[PDB]
Amino acid sequence: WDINNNX
Amino acid sequence: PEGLEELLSAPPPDLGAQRRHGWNPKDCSENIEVKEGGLYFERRPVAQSTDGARGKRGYSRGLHAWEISWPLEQRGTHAVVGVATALAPLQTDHYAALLGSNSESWGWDIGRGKLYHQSKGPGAPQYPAGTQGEQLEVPERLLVVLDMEEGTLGYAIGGTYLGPAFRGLKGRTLYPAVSAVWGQCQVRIRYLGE
């Protein structure tokens, strides 16, 4: 769920 | 636009030609899956990685144009659209403007409007020039125009050519390319000739 939809 | 108008007026290449000119499963980042035989790619959700794909076909002569469809919700921090030679890297282990950060790639950051070619980042020219601080927005679809007779790379938005972003491309074999950072982003390429 990081800024770039990566978790 | 006279030669471009003649290219775009012609019947569009069919499914077979679009696939042969689409994304290459054998020349894309290890984190990218090419779908529908080249019509689009999906980048898997990997952290701190910028990943790119190259078209199956390199152009060194004539006029070539392709439509990139890239949804706004799937661009993230660095969405770059452009071209590259066959030796440009297709992966890096951080979030960056990969396409255009070396001598082998040329790209337009469609989020910031900056042009990259052998560029680190700061001081990159704005495209269209003179639009910094105007908060422009590149829509979902965009046309990429490579003129190998004149050695230029340009872009068209809503049927309007923005002019050449890059020049001095003659003698090179250039491939459609993009670099993405967004987990599960799907980028379509629709080749239109010549």
Swiss-Prot record, chain B:
One of its GO terms (biological process) is ubiquitin-dependent protein catabolic process. It comes from the Eukaryota. Keywords: Cytoplasm, Host-virus interaction, Ubl conjugation pathway. Residues 1-194 form the B30.2/SPRY domain. The keyword Cytoplasm applies. Pathway: Protein modification; protein ubiquitination. GO terms for cellular component: cytosol; SCF ubiquitin ligase complex. It is found in: Cytoplasm; Cytoplasm, Cytosol. GO terms for molecular function: ubiquitin-like ligase-substrate adaptor activity. Its main location: cytoplasm. Belongs to the SPSB family. Substrate recognition component of a SCF-like ECS (Elongin BC-CUL2/5-SOCS-box protein) E3 ubiquitin-protein ligase complex which mediates the ubiquitination and subsequent proteasomal degradation of target proteins. Negatively regulates nitric oxide (NO) production and limits cellular toxicity in activated macrophages by mediating the ubiquitination and proteasomal degradation of NOS2. Acts as a bridge which links NOS2 with the ECS E3 ubiquitin ligase complex components ELOC and CUL5. Component of the probable ECS(SPSB2) E3 ubiquitin-protein ligase complex which contains CUL5, RNF7/RBX2, Elongin BC complex and SPSB2. Interacts with CUL5, RNF7, ELOB and ELOC. Interacts with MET. Interacts (via B30.2/SPRY domain) with PAWR; this interaction occurs in association with the Elongin BC complex. Interacts with NOS2. (Microbial infection) Interacts (via C-terminus) with HCV envelope glycoprotein E1. Interacts (via C-terminus) with HCV non-structural protein 5A; this interaction targets NS5A for ubiquitination and degradation. The SOCS box domain mediates the interaction with the Elongin BC complex, an adapter module in different E3 ubiquitin ligase complexes. Essential for its ability to link NOS2 and the ECS E3 ubiquitin ligase complex components ELOC and CUL5. This is SPRY domain-containing SOCS box protein 2. It comes from Homo sapiens (Human). The lineage of its organism: Eukaryota, Metazoa, Chordata, Craniata, Vertebrata.
